[PDB]
């Protein structure tokens, strides 16, 4: 199923009939960082499997719902169970949910993820406001927009120079200062590693040479689809480890360690993004 | 349809029966740089859709013709409407037209493209004679030759050390001097970005670190297929902008700007390559 | 055919019924480096085409056998005719033979390959004990584990920090010293170039900047599948040329030159790995 105008409209039609919510904000939460989705008011949960033309996710398994409702008086839509390209999903499957958000009226997309630290000033538990990216799949002919262009949504050759909105990064830093945890907030460049293997020690050393501050396996595909169709983005990474230090000390990383850091910061991140939603222009 | 010996011979058979032209020179022109194709004498236009085994291009749309005729007394064949891998074409679809050129007797392939400037000595409107490349898709398992080797055309493991003929670069520079625009002519290394997104600001900073002089979304796949089957190549890039300066100044690039630069240089480039064809050994 | 638990068990069942050998060591030999497979005692040769669920290799052609028997008193299994991803094989086809080795009881995998030299201290004919890698396909969304995870074999997000066993590198160096050819033995980082084109001169210059010591077109996919399911690996590269020197001198490389170096070192490498097998803990 192609992520074209007709197929996305069919999905959005079903969603409208069921929810009666017209959102202008969208949110995609990282693994272990989805608690805010349980605080949505007057909410409506829609499993992907019931939405026309939505991708099939049974092979991967686990939760997959679209959740609509109110937060801080604002109308939002959330992806509960996000799609990763290391699972084998195609460009079309990743893009369609984002283009459905567009047809529903979304103008701002907030994203969180877990990532490894490359910059030496980064430690486990820090936050990184993403200001740019290095898209290794894109350079290597696996860009999320490879294929026919869907002209109704955006141009053939999009410019990514302003994909990470400056004002939204400023508003997020301001809230960190009002609550006195700005010491945890950095900015940096995000490198996209297709995955699913964690970056090797020598791959981490390479990324340091190339000016990368963090590395992860998500986010960039959704950012490009949102920028293509004119949606503003804020993306924040939670640092689970510093891969450069681990390589120098012969220390390992694993998913169990990643999720422990997520649990330690989940509540502060929930509080942080709830206020962001409330304060959005 | 595979780009094998049998399928390419079928296409070349049709072309011979229709044109009566046996060319030894081939040309692939960049976007907005195809005016010379309208100056071909005693010409014959063949739309791709009528040639057996030629790839289907209706989804992408726009012009797609093979044009044969005479220029400067030399017999040539031109691709009017070239195939880009960011459209979703397979390795086999990109390769077959080049291997048809081979069976028709082509020994020299001239190529032009539009690209972004990485080297700080490059400005909008300059020309770059390509002397080598960095093939990011090739490193990442999307090389144009991934698949079974077609032994009739070339070896399993080709050497690209002489893919960009030295003498042809010299002849092109000589003509620039005779007409006194050598101040516009550089040489440099071409980085292949799969696309279709323009290189991001931080991707441009990375390419500077790696020794790249220009970046574009084409050319390298055709060069590799031509080098595989023993065809000499000259490739020239037209610089539409300097991506490093744009990143430092927070300036954008877009297709509308690219085509404006193409229009400003199209006539000088036509004059330039017409003489090259006439002067080829 | 997916490289899942059920399909791999079917293949291993056939192999058990035919050989009566239960190996705990596996070996994959590089091109021109397979002579040791002719020295296997009480051996049993099984062509891939007869083993259920094994990948089809007729298009590529050439030898493809699984060989079981005894070496130095140890029980081994060998892949005679290895699969390269530049031929067009899928992730599933590359992985299944390795996961069959696992179900047969393999705990150690020994691998040899031919590669180009990037580090300036490397010359034609040297050996390189691989201690890490840079996986360009993996960064670019062509990792061998892209797809659904086969939970019975390993985790979703494996850590590659210890994929190249330290003790095995030490044992291999020790044997080189006992026979007084340690002057040929280096250690270094292996860059994975998808291929099948040899690295271009400017790609070699890039890899030097990035800290790569050697470059080749194999090994990394098998290493990742073995590390995923808990198999220890030793990997050794034979250097056929120094790509940096060749680029500075405008010298070419080709397969004929590669195989000549392989012939010159094949007997010493056979002797070397026979003792390694005998001395494994
Ligand atoms: N901690 C971590 N490291 C790498 C990565 O891709 C995700 N998370
Ligand atoms: N001006 C420009 N920049 C990048 C590119 O790939 C093409 N053209
Ligand atoms: N000699 C050589 N060089 C490169 C390569 O990929 C294999 N062998």
- What is the DSSP track for C258-272? HHHHHHHHHHHHHHH
The C-alpha of A139 sits at a distance from chain C's nearest C-alpha, in angstroms, of 8
Q: What is the DSSP letter of A153?
A: T
Distance CA A249, CA A212 (A): 20
Distance CA B223, CA B132 (A): 10
CB contact under 8 Å between A251 and C224, yes or no, is no
A87:C148 CB<8 A: yes
- Do the Cβ atoms of A255 and C146 come within 8 Å? no
The reply to whether ligand 2 has any atom less than 6 angstroms from the CB of B241 is yes
Please indicate whether, in this complex, the C-beta atoms of C146 and A85 are within 8 angstroms of each other: yes
Nearest to B194 by CA among B241, B137, B243: B137
Contact of C182 with C226, CB cutoff 8 Å: no
Binding-site residues of B for adenine sit at 199, 241
Experimental method: X-ray
- The CA distance from A17 to the nearest CA of chain B, in Å, is 33
State how beta strands B214-216 and B108-117 pair: antiparallel
The span from the CA of B210 to the CA of B194, in Å, is 17
Nearest to C156 among A196, A209, A252 (CB): A196
CB–CB contact A254 C156 (8 Å)? no
Q: Which residues in A lie closer than 8 A to residue B60 (C-beta atoms)? A: 148
C234-to-B160, C27, C170, C182, C272 alpha-carbon distances in Å: 31, 10, 10, 17, 13
Question: In the structure encoding, which two tokens stand for residue A78, read together?
Answer: 């959330």
Binding-face residues of C in 8-27 toward A, CB within 8 A: none
Q: At what angle do helices A91-103 and A5-19 cross, to 10 degrees?
A: 50
Is residue C113 classed as helix, strand or coil in its secondary structure? Answer: strand
Question: A196: cis peptide before it, omega within 30°?
Answer: yes
Both tokens of C258, joined, read 């590669």
B65: its two tokens: 């013709």
**Which amino acid residue places its CA nearest to atom 7 of ligand 1?**
A115
Where does ligand 1 bind, in terms of residues with CB under 6 Å?
A: A 114-116, 193, 198-199, 215-217, 240-241, 253, 258
Q: Answer for the pair A115, A215: CB distance below 8 angstroms, yes or no.
A: yes
Instruction: Give the residue from B82, B97, B95 showing the smallest Cα distance to B148.
Output: B95
CB C49 within 8 A of CB C64: yes
Number of other residues whose CB lies within 10 A of the CB of residue B245: 15
Count interface pairs B-C at CB distance under 8 A.
Answer: 106
Q: Which of A119, A159, A228 to mutate to test the interface with B (most CBs of B within 10 A)?
A: A159
- Give, rounded to a whole angstrom, the gap between the first and last alpha carbons of chain B: 36
B199: left (phi over 0), alpha (psi -120 to 50) or beta: beta
Q: Which two three-digit tokens encode residue A95? A: 């893009």
Q: What angle do CA C219, C220, C221 make, to 5 degrees?
A: 95
What are the domain boundaries of chain A?
1-281
Q: Alpha-carbon dihedral of residues A5, A6, A7, A8, nearest 10 degrees?
A: 50
Helix (H, G, I), strand (E, B) or coil at C239: strand
Burial category of C179 from C-beta neighbours within 10 Å (exposed 0-12, middle 13-18, buried 19 and up)? exposed
SS (H, E, C) C67-91: EEEEECCEEEEEEECCCCHHHCCCH
Q: Among residues B256, B258, B224, which one has the least CA distance to residue B117? A: B258
Phi then psi dihedrals of residue A19, to 5 deg: -105, -40
C160 → closest Cβ in A139, A197, A250: A197
User: Which among B132, B140, B149 is the nearest to C194, CB-wise?
Assistant: B140
Question: Which residues numbered 195-234 in C keep a CB inside 8 Å of some CB on A?
Answer: 209-211, 224
* Chain B residues within 8 A of A141 when measuring between CB atoms: 85-86, 136-137, 140, 142, 194
Exposure string for A131-154, b = 16+ CB within 10 A, e = fewer = bbbbbbbbbbbbbbbbbebbeebb
**How many angstroms separate the alpha carbon of residue C203 from the centre of ligand 1?**
28
Q: Which ligand is nearest to the CA of A114?
A: 1
The secondary structure element, H or E, covering residue C248 is helix C243-249
3-state helix, strand, coil in chain B (%, to 5): 40, 25, 35
What tokens appear for A44 in the block? 């409506």
**Cβ contacts of C30 on chain B, cutoff 8 Å:** none
Partners of B44 in the β-ladder: B68
Residue B15: CB atoms within 10 Å: 22
Specify the CATH number for B1-281; select among 3.40.190.10, 3.30.300.100, 3.30.420.40, 3.40.50.1580.
3.40.50.1580
Beta strands per DSSP E along C95-183: 108-117, 127-135
Q: Does any ligand 2 atom lie closer than 6 A to the CB of residue B115? A: yes
Residue nearest to atom 4 of ligand 3 (CA): C116
Give the total residue count for chain A.
281
Report d(CA B255, CA B221) in Å as an integer.
22
Q: Is B160 within 8 Å of C193 when comparing Cβ atoms?
A: no
Region class of B193: left (phi > 0), else alpha (psi between -120 and 50), else beta: beta
d(CA A127, CA A217): 17
Q: Where are the beta strands (DSSP E) in chain A?
A: 25-28, 41-47, 65-71, 74-80, 108-117, 127-135, 185-192, 214-216, 232-242
Number of residues that make up chain B = 281
Contacts of C166 (CB under 8 A, 6+ apart): none
Which atom of ligand 1 lies closest to the CA of A116? 3
Eight-class DSSP state of B106: -
State in Å, rounded, how far the first CA of chain A is from the last one.
36
Residue positions forming the annotated binding site of B: 198-199, 217, 241, 255
Do residues A194 and A136 make contact, with C-beta atoms less than 8 angstroms apart?
yes
Residue A40 distance to chain C (closest CA, Å): 30
C244 to chain B, minimum CA–CA distance in Å? 12
Ligand 2 neighbour B253 (Cβ under 6 A): yes
- Residue identifier of the C-alpha nearest atom 8 of ligand 1: A115
Binding annotation of A for cytidine:
198-199, 217, 255
Distance CA A11, CA A2 (A): 12
Cited resolution, angstroms: 2.0
CA distance B240 to chain A (A): 14
Identify whether the C-beta of residue C147 lies closer than 8 Å to the C-beta of residue A87.
yes
Q: Which residue owns the Cα nearest ligand 2 atom 8?
A: B115
Name all residues whose Cβ lies below 6 A of ligand 3: C 114-116, 193, 198-199, 215-217, 240-241, 253, 258
Probe ligand 2: pick from B82, B116, B128, max atoms within 8 Å of CB? B116
Q: A189: which chain B residues are within 8 Å (Cβ-Cβ)?
A: 202
User: Of the candidates A27, A22, A23, A21, which has an alpha carbon nearest to the alpha carbon of residue A276?
Assistant: A27
Q: Is the CB of B215 under 6 A from ligand 2?
A: yes
Integer Cα distance of C100 and C94 in angstroms: 11
């Amino acid at each position: 199923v192609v992520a074209n105008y007709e197929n996305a409209s069919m999905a959005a039609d079903y969603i409208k009939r069921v929810s009666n919510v017209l959102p202008d904000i969208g949110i995609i939460c990282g693994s272990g960082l989805g608690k805010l989705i349980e605080e949505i008011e007057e909410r409506k949960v829609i499993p992907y499997i019931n939405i026309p033309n939505f991708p099939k996710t049974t092979v991967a398994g686990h939760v997959g719902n679209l959740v609509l409702g109110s937060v801080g008086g604002r109308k939002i839509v959330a992806m509960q169970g996000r799609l990763h390209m290391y699972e084998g999903y195609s460009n079309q499957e990743i893009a369609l949910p984002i283009r459905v958000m567009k047809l529903l009226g979304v103008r701002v997309l907030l994203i969180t993820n877990l990532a490894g630290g490359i910059n030496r000033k980064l430690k486990s538990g820090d936050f990184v406001l993403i200001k740019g990216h290095i898209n290794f799949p894109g350079l290597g002919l696996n860009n999320v927009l490879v294929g026919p262009n869907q002209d109704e949504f955006g141009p053939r050759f999009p410019d990514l120079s302003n994909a990470y909105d400056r004002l939204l990064q400023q508003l997020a830093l301001k809230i960190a200062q009002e609550n006195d945890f700005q010491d945890l907030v950095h900015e940096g460049v995000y490198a996209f590693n297709g995955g699913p293997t964690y970056e090797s020690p020598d791959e981490s050393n390479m990324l340091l040479k190339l000016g990368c501050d963090v590395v992860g396996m998500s986010t960039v595909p959704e950012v490009i689809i949102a920028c293509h169709c004119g949606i503003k983005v804020l993306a924040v990474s939670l640092i689970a480890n510093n891969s450069i230090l681990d390589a120098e000390n012969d220390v390992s990383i694993n998913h169990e360690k990643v999720l422990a850091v997520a649990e330690k910061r989940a509540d502060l991140l929930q509080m942080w993004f709830k206020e962001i939603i409330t304060r959005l222009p």
